Amino acid sequence: MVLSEGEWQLVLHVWAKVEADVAGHGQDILIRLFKSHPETLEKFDRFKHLKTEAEMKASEDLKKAGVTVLTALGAILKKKGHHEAELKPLAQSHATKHKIPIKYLEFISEAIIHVLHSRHPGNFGADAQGAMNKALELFRKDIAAKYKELGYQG
Ligand code: HEM
């Protein structure tokens, strides 16, 4: 799949807003993920013990993890499709080391869209949400293809 320059512009315009507060968006997104799909929390030996949202919001480790996910995702989106180099180390660690199924990437995609919609209603109308969904599907499709080459595809 290929996004048009117009769609990339919609994605990068809302992402520029996200970058004004990377730690806050990262936290919101990971908490949204863990509450919506608690099974994903088990994949993290660092957060596994966190029982409530209050505990998640107070976790300094969780806030740092959020910055890490968003920064890597941001580097990918800014490539506007030419992200093969960035995808390789990412696909290997998630497939071989952490064993994260594609299903879980759809869950986090859903959390990202939910949070952008909550925090940026003015810059995240239907067209911009369609563009972001298209960008994340591109991401998932390429990651799934690498999973298969690495011998996992989960
Ligand atoms: C947009 C999505 C994602 C991005 C860009 C991303 C990025 C990263 C990065 C950059 C790291 C650091 C080093 C490494 O490669 O291991 C990492 C670690 C990890 N990721 Fe993700 N990840 C994503 C989604 C997920 C999902 C959905 C899960 C789990 C449900 C997950 C679980 C893990 C785990 C278990 C680790 C290591 C935690 C630790 O021991 O510090 N990731 N991820």
Swiss-Prot record:
Keyword Signal assigned to the entry: answer is no
Which EC class heads this enzyme's classification?
oxidoreductase
Q: Which reaction does it catalyse?
A: Fe(III)-heme b-[protein] + nitric oxide + H2O = Fe(II)-heme b-[protein] + nitrite + 2 H(+); H2O2 + AH2 = A + 2 H2O
Q: Which residues bind O2?
A: 65
Q: Which residues carry this modification: Phosphoserine?
A: 4
Chain residues that bind heme b? 94
Subunit structure, interactors included: Monomeric.
**What's the source species for this entry?**
Physeter macrocephalus
* Keywords tagged on the record: Cytoplasm, Heme, Iron, Metal-binding, Muscle protein, Oxidoreductase, Oxygen transport, Phosphoprotein, Transport
The record's function comment reads: Monomeric heme protein which primary function is to store oxygen and facilitate its diffusion within muscle tissues. Reversibly binds oxygen through a pentacoordinated heme iron and enables its timely and efficient release as needed during periods of heightened demand. Depending on the oxidative conditions of tissues and cells, and in addition to its ability to bind oxygen, it also has a nitrite reductase activity whereby it regulates the production of bioactive nitric oxide.
Major localisation: cytoplasm
Domain Globin positions? 2-148
Q: What is this protein called?
A: Myoglobin
